[PDB]
Design a protein around this ligand. Structure first.
Ligand code: 7X7
Ligand code: MG
Ligand code: MG
Ligand code: MG
Length: 273
């Protein structure tokens, strides 16, 4: 939906994306209370393919409604700069939010975050939407610590296209890297890496290993070890997500069910390696 630019006030530049700035501001439309929004801008000097690539993210988001998927408020297209407005997530990207708060949230809180991400993914899979870039950097966190999935776009990765973005190797399931077969099952592998990011308070998956070191290690049966203090039951769910055979990995409803069980039985989280 097209938003009248008079309805929008931009307050502060809070980040950068691929095509421009990310800002915090305020949306106020006739008949509605004023709300806080995030605003992605696309200023002059862009091509129309890029304009449509930019705006595709809004088209896709506008197809979804779920409490763990970032909500679109609208777009500004008949004015400059071109804008996408979403709900504002006050704590920003999860990886950096966790590094900032290293060791400061309880296991139960971290499992609740992971449950939120899994529910988002459960919804997307149900919608037959394959995310392809599921990583803690793409999870946004509000002031109540509710985690929501973000980063929507359907553009092939560069390796999928003419001979003459790149695949996020560290998050990507082996068959997806080898064959570019991206499915909800390859998203479940990425979710496993996200679990590890969360329980490690935002450490980089595979530390300093090169992308090709990662590819080889995984092919040769290596899997990330439990982060420090990580409950064994969470690490095992990670290992389930990391099965080489994609059909053996848990589907997202099963992932959510497993996390809900943990939350109902928090004593089980006390078993650590
Ligand atoms: Cl990821 C994304 C996708 C599409 C879109 C966006 C985003 N970014 C986004 C959406 C909602 N909330 C945020 N929150 C945020 C971004 C950058 C920095 C921060 N800070 C929070 C406070 O600590 C400093 C970082 C929050 N971003 O904004 C408008 O359209
Ligand atoms: Mg993506
Ligand atoms: Mg991406
Ligand atoms: Mg540490």
């Amino acid at each position: 939906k097209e938003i009248d630019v008079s309805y929008v006030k931009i307050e502060e530049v809070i980040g950068a994306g691929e095509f421009g700035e990310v800002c915090r501001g305020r949306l106020k439309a006739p008949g509605k209370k004023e709300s806080c929004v995030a605003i992605k801008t696309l200023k002059g000097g862009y091509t129309e393919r890029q304009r449509r690539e930019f705006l595709s993210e809004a088209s896709i988001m506008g197809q979804f409604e779920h409490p763990n998927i970032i909500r679109l408020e609208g777009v500004v297209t008949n004015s400059m700069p071109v804008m996408i407005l979403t709900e504002f997530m006050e704590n920003g990207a999860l990886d950096s939010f966790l590094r900032l708060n290293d060791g400061q949230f309880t296991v139960i809180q971290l499992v609740g975050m992971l449950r939120g991400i899994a529910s988002g993914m459960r919804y997307l899979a149900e919608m037959s939407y394959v995310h392809r870039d599921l990583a803690a950097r793409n999870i946004l966190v509000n002031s109540n610590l509710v985690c929501k999935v973000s980063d929507f776009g359907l553009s092939r990765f560069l390796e999928e296209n003419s001979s003459d973005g790149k695949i996020p190797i560290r998050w990507t399931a082996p068959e997806a890297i080898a064959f570019r077969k991206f499915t909800s099952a390859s998203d479940a592998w990425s979710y496993g890496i996200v679990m590890w990011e969360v329980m490690s308070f935002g450490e980089r998956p595979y530390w300093d290993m090169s992308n090709q070191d990662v590819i080889n290690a995984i092919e040769q049966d290596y899997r990330l070890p439990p982060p420090p203090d990580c409950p064994t039951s969470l690490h095992q769910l990670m290992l389930d997500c990391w099965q080489k055979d994609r059909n053996a990995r848990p589907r997202f409803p099963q992932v959510v069910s497993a996390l809900d069980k943990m939350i109902r039985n928090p004593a089980s989280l006390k078993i650590v390696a």
